[PDB]
Design a protein around this ligand. Structure first.
Ligand code: A1B2A
Ligand code: ZN
Length: 139
């Protein structure tokens, strides 16, 4: 689990969005596994606007942060799950690192701010949904 809180927005994995996220919906995209809802309180986080390909992510299944090198946002085939049929997920960045079911939502950060959130895993890999292109999160 986990979310990004920036301005009056809350960014979560679309497959983990709550009834309240959907009732306050701003934008969602199944192909990216992202959903953004509106909040009444002002959020804590800063979004990176950069092309970093190294950073640090939080892994809840180990209660620890790990440094990672990750691929540029791209279209990657993701196997069927209880949440989605087998499909290509866009704007996804892969890295070698630990991730289990339950780790989705962990934040990936570089020196410029938040880069994205854990969205895929297994096989000693961890995939992150990029948010750096969502320029409207800041205005
Ligand atoms: C975190 N993952 C994981 C880790 C170890 C072992 C098995 C898994 C599966 C899970 C996974 O990749 N998912 C499931 C939930 C929806 C995600 C999506 N963006 O489509 C895909
Ligand atoms: Zn950066």
């Amino acid at each position: 689990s986990g979310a990004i809180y920036v301005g009056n927005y809350r960014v979560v994995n679309r497959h983990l969005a709550t009834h309240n996220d959907w009732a306050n919906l701003v934008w969602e995209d199944s192909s990216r596994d992202l959903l953004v809802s509106s909040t009444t309180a002002q959020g804590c986080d800063t979004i990176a606007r950069c092309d970093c390909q190294t950073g640090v992510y939080y892994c809840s299944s180990r209660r620890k942060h790990y440094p990672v090198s990750f691929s540029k946002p791209s279209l990657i085939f993701v196997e069927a799950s209880e949440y989605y049929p087998a499909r290509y997920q866009s704007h996804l960045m892969l890295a070698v690192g630990h991730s289990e079911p339950g780790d989705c939502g962990g934040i990936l950060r570089c020196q410029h701010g938040v880069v994205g959130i854990v969205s895929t895993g297994g096989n000693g890999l961890v995939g992150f949904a990029d948010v750096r292109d969502l320029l409207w999160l800041d205005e």
